Amino acid sequence: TKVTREEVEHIANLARLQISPEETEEMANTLESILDFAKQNDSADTEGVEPTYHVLDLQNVLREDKAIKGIPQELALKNAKETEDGQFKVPTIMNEEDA
Amino acid sequence: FETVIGLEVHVELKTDSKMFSPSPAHFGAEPNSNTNVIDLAYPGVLPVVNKRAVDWAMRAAMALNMEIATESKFDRKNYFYPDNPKAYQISQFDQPIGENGYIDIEVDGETKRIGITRLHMEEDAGKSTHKGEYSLVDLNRQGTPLIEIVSEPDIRSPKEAYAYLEKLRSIIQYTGVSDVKMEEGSLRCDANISLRPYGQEKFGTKAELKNLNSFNYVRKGLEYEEKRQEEELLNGGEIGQETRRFDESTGKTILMRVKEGSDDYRYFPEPDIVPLYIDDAWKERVRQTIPELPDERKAKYVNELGLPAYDAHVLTLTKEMSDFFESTIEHGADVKLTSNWLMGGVNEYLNKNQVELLDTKLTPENLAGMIKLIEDGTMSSKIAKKVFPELAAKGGNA
Amino acid sequence: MSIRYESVENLLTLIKDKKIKPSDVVKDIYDAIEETDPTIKSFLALDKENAIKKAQELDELQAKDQMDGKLFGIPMGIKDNIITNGLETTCASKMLEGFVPIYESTVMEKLHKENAVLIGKLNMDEFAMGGSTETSYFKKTVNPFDHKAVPGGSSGGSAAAVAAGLVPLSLGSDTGGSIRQPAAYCGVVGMKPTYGRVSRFGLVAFASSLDQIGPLTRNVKDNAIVLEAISGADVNDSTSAPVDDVDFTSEIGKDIKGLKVALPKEYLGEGVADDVKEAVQNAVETLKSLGAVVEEVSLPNTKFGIPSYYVIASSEASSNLSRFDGIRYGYHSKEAHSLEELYKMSRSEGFGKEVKRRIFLGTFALSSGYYDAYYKKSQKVRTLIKNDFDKVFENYDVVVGPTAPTTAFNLGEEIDDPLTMYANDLLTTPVNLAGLPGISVPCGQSNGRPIGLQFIGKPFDEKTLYRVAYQYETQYNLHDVYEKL
Ligand SMILES: [Mg+2]
Numbered sequence: 001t002k003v004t005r006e007e008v009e010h011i012a013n014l015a016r017l018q019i020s021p022e023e024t025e026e027m028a029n030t031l032e033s034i035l036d037f038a039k040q041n042d043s044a045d046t047e048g049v050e051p052t053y054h055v056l057d058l059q060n061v062l063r064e065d066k067a068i069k070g071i072p073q074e075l076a077l078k079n080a081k082e083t084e085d086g087q088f089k090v091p092t093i094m095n096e097e098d099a
Numbered sequence: 100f101e102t103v104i105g106l107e108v109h110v111e112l113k114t115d116s117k118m119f120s121p122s123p124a125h126f127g128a129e130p131n132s133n134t135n136v137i138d139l140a141y142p143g144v145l146p147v148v149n150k151r152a153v154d155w156a157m158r159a160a161m162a163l164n165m166e167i168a169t170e171s172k173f174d175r176k177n178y179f180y181p182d183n184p185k186a187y188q189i190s191q192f193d194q195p196i197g198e199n200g201y202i203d204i205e206v207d208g209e210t211k212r213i214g215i216t217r218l219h220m221e222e223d224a225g226k227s228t229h230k231g232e233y234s235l236v237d238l239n240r241q242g243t244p245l246i247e248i249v250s251e252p253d254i255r256s257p258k259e260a261y262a263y264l265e266k267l268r269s270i271i272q273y274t275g276v277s278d279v280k281m282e283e284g285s286l287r288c289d290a291n292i293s294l295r296p297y298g299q300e301k302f303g304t305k306a307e308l309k310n311l312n313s314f315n316y317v318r319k320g321l322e323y324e325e326k327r328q329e330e331e332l333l334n335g336g337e338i339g340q341e342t343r344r345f346d347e348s349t350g351k352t353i354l355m356r357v358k359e360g361s362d363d364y365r366y367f368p369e370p371d372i373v374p375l376y377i378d379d380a381w382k383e384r385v386r387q388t389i390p391e392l393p394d395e396r397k398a399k400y401v402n403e404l405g406l407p408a409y410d411a412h413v414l415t416l417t418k419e420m421s422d423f424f425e426s427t428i429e430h431g432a433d434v435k436l437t438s439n440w441l442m443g444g445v446n447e448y449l450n451k452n453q454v455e456l457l458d459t460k461l462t463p464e465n466l467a468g469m470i471k472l473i474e475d476g477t478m479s480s481k482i483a484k485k486v487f488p489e490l491a492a493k494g495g496n497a
Numbered sequence: 498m499s500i501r502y503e504s505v506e507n508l509l510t511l512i513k514d515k516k517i518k519p520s521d522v523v524k525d526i527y528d529a530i531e532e533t534d535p536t537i538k539s540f541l542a543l544d545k546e547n548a549i550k551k552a553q554e555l556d557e558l559q560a561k562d563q564m565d566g567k568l569f570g571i572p573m574g575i576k577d578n579i580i581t582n583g584l585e586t587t588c589a590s591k592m593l594e595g596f597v598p599i600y601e602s603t604v605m606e607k608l609h610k611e612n613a614v615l616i617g618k619l620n621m622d623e624f625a626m627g628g629s630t631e632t633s634y635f636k637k638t639v640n641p642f643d644h645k646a647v648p649g650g651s652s653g654g655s656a657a658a659v660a661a662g663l664v665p666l667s668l669g670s671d672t673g674g675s676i677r678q679p680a681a682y683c684g685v686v687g688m689k690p691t692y693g694r695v696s697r698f699g700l701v702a703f704a705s706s707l708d709q710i711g712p713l714t715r716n717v718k719d720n721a722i723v724l725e726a727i728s729g730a731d732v733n734d735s736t737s738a739p740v741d742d743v744d745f746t747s748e749i750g751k752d753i754k755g756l757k758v759a760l761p762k763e764y765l766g767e768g769v770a771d772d773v774k775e776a777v778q779n780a781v782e783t784l785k786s787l788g789a790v791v792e793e794v795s796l797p798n799t800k801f802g803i804p805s806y807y808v809i810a811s812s813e814a815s816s817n818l819s820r821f822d823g824i825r826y827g828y829h830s831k832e833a834h835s836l837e838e839l840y841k842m843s844r845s846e847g848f849g850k851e852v853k854r855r856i857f858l859g860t861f862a863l864s865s866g867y868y869d870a871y872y873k874k875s876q877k878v879r880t881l882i883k884n885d886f887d888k889v890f891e892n893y894d895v896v897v898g899p900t901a902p903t904t905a906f907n908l909g910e911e912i913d914d915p916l917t918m919y920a921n922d923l924l925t926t927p928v929n930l931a932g933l934p935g936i937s938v939p940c941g942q943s944n945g946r947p948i949g950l951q952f953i954g955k956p957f958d959e960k961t962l963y964r965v966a967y968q969y970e971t972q973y974n975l976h977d978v979y980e981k982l
Pocket of ligand 1 (some may be wrong): 109221247
């Protein structure tokens with residue numbers, strides 16, 4: 001109930017997912033149904049219950065500060081589709097139309 | 100009409116390896132040669148917490164008079180950007196390793212205790228070189244352990260801001276966890292400023308100042324911004340939330356964007372890193388691993404070895420300088436003599452020769468002599484003119 | 498394709514007694530594949546050449562009488578969301594088609610160390626989101642017991658390749674049931690060890706706090722063996738548990754008289770079909786005929802498992818899947834001229850419908866104004882779900898009930914109905930939420946389609962799970978049926 005075009009496009013943006021106003025409507029409803037589905041948790045009594053962030057009760061797992069040489073540039077770029085001069089190449093025209 | 104401003108400062112910890120990856124923290128000039136699957140954010144990689152980075156983060160927070168957390172976990176700060184591959188920076192939101200501390204500063208007038216609200220651990224982002232209509236991306240620096248220090252919004256003028264950066268830099272420098280040099284990026288700073296006319300609680304426009312690269316430079320933007328929204332408040336002004344870039348050449352701040360609200364980073368606990376439980380023993384080890392900081396080191400130069408005001412501040416500006424001074428002192432250099440010799444003479448020699456490595460050149464063993472040869476041995480000063488330089492960039496005694 | 502139906506154990510000994518050459522064992526595997534997968538469609542990338550080579554190396558070692566490794570010369574299929582150095586790993590997504598890992602996951606490391614033989618990668622739902630493997634960008638795996646049915650999700654290829662006699666063992670990943678549900682649908686043995694029992698280094702992340710790798714086999718024993726080869730702490734995974742006792746076969750073959758077994762009433766609730774329910778109750782009786790003591794108990798917060806699981810899983814996914822921008826690897830949109838387009842176009846074109854649904858939900862559940870009411874709430878609910886188990890475990894050794902509410906459903910039956918698809922996780926999600934170990938073994942068949950019996954254990958008590966599972970298996974199993982399909 002009440003999930004507007006606007007929120008749908010604000011989320012798409014927070015997620016960097018391209019969507020068409022021919023997908024937005026469809027997504028507004030989907031989310032809505034999913035949320036209604038999600039709303040089921042509200043019937044659960046959590047007053048005073050601490051959130052579970054970790055299921056395993058470990059503690060202080062740290063790594064000694066000893067460097068390990070990195071892989072070759074060649075290995076690091078091997079899977080990237082666009083590269084130039086040993087780096088990753090990407091568009092950067094900052095115009096509030098594109099961005 | 101207080102101009103309220105706070106400072107967001109990041110410091111680069113100088114560890115061997117990165118914060119959540121074994122890759123070295125120091126890299127060569129070859130791009131993307133200082134990485135691994137972790138720094139490259141490959142699918143299925145995990146973060147592994149650098150132990151020393153924690154010890155140093157909580158060493159610098161104590162030196163900052165902060166309450167050290169007992170429970171401290173990491174969180175993800177989610178955002179998409181070429182130099183941040185995972186699309187989330189592992190940081191801390193609640194439970195920052197250090198909270199509510201302060202530092203004392205002297206600004207025109209007297210002493211003002213400025214609060215520091217928090218100190219948390221983060222990882223640095225990679226660098227994005229803007230070439231042509233494209234962008235080049237080097238992940239060599241990605242993952243470098245940083246710590247974020249946010250002042251309480253207590254500082255009250257572009258000058259108090261400078262004094263703040265100086266003392267802070269000074270204190271962090273003494274803990275030996277960072278060279279904290281802004282020309283080297285091991286110390287960065289962003290400022291937030293807003294004006295609220297007296298008698299009322301409402302503020303005018305609020306701005307985040309970006310691209311402030313030097314202590315001297317933050318002041319410029321700070322005091323320019325101050326005047327900029329000073330007009331806005333009076334003339335007509337349209338209240339708003341904004342981010343502004345400081346133009347080094349023109350000295351003005353340029354509006355680079357107007358916030359539509361509060362940047363949503365979807366902060367949430369990092370499940371891949373088990374929580375940290377910092378006990379007393381642990382806190383002790385690092386407690387004791389702290390020298391005498393500048394303030395109490397300076398208060399030591401006041402009544403004991405009763406030196407001046409100016410003197411105390413500049414001799415405690417760096418640990419090395421202050422160590423040099425005290426090593427040279429017992430050696431046989433009259434208190435004042437060396438003070439005046441370091442204050443100016445050596446300080447001016449360093450700046451004029453950029454010989455900032457006060458350690459691999461002239462030594463307290465060597466310098467100690469010169470001051471005696473002047474003290475009484477041979478007679479007085481002018482000879483000191485060139486004996487000093489040579490003795491500084493060359494040999495060992497007169 | 499002659500030993501293609503032999504168990505890991507027997508195949509193991511058949512190789513140690515030099516009654517068979519590793520190179521021929523593999524020849525049989527690929528023969529099986531070539532003949533059967535065209536119909537089953539459970540395999541994605543095949544690693545035949547490398548496999549061939551490794552076996553040739555194993556023949557020498559055989560001859561020299563130096564056969565080391567718990568899984569020497571044993572064939573293995575690996576879910577395609579588990580990284581394999583040099584082998585195309587796709588997570589069954591367009592986003593990663595053609596992706597060749599430049600590092601080795603920890604379980605594969607461990608598996609090579611034991612001299613297993615990588616036969617290939619298995620099909621699955623895209624990025625482990627789905628309950629039928631139908632979302633794969635590549636193909637739809639089918640249930641060996643019924644070709645009109647789904648194999649389950651997300652590890653359908655792992656459950657199908659084993660049930661179809663293509664490999665004696667396979668790995669899967671379970672986030673909310675992705676190992677146990679496919680196993681239940683394909684009538685095989687699948688286990689999701691305790692959270693922390695198996696390194697996640699090299700597991701393409703779905704939900705970091707819920708994810709976990711585990712094995713799938715044709716019998717309880719082969720399964721325990723495989724778990725011993727992948728369990729253990731790892732300096733590459735901070736959440737990996739420092740528990741040395743990685744022996745799971747020691748108590749197998751031992752009786753279960755006196756074993757205190759809890760049968761949650763909620764596990765036989767309204768969402769459970771009539772046939773699944775009848776089979777599990779006959780299973781309860783079987784356990785009684787074996788001495789175990791079975792009594793009803795309640796896990797009241799069960800009903801909240803699916804929703805709290807989707808909110809948590811989706812949320813984490815909305816963060817673990819963000820690295821996919823087609824910059825350093827993966828799908829890279831060609832029609833992008835701006836940086837915003839590059840992220841938005843690559844991601845929208847590279848991800849399938851279901852994956853984008855989760856991300857949408859997850860991103861929304863974590864956003865400003867909703868965080869406390871959705872994500873935080875779910876995490877609190879997560880606490881409730883675990884407390885339920887903590888309580889039951891105060892008086893019971895294990896917990897039993899059905900793995901899935903129904904038999905496997907039809908291909909295309911719920912592919913366009915995500916909500917009903919989700920309902921299939923009713924009985925599996927509480928386990929990951931509590932971080933417990935849970936195992937599924939067959940316990941029946943309704944119209945030919947297998948039904949699953951699940952045993953949930955205390956943390957790191959997989960051995961007790963294998964003990965009771967083995968006992969039950971001596972009374973019922975489908976050991977002789979696979980051979981006939
Ligand atoms: Mg920061």
